[PDB]
Ligand binder design. Structure first.
Ligand SMILES: [Zn+2]
Ligand SMILES: [Zn+2]
Length: 113
């Protein structure tokens, strides 16, 4: 039901690494940063939510949808490091809508085995 701990990019150092050296694709809804770790056997997801969405509830909600959207995809996705920045126009998406969006970027940055 939930994304495993090991599949989560926790601390800032890891993020900065992806930002500075990773690759990027952007949507009207999200900015997906994917670094690359050949030394990682499983993928990692980091979440950055605009914060220009104030309601912790809208932010926590959107995070869950992306995390859960990833769970549905953990198998078809390369084992890299991902950072998804949720843009303002993502705040009101439904799971289905979020998943279609993430797969736009995933198909863009060819992160599909
Ligand atoms: Zn550098
Ligand atoms: Zn590394």
């Amino acid at each position: 039901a939930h994304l495993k701990k090991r599949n989560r990019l926790k601390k800032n150092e890891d993020f900065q690494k992806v930002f500075k050296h990773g690759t990027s694709v952007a949507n009207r809804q999200f900015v997906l940063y994917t670094l690359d770790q050949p030394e990682n056997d499983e993928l990692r997801v980091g979440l950055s939510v605009s914060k220009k969405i104030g309601n912790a509830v809208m932010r926590n909600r959107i995070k869950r949808l992306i995390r859960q959207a990833f769970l549905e995809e953990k198998e078809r996705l390369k084992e890299k490091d991902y950072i998804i920045i949720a843009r303002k126009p993502a705040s009101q998406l439904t799971y289905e809508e979020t998943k279609k969006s993430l797969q736009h970027l995933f198909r863009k940055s060819s992160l599909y085995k």
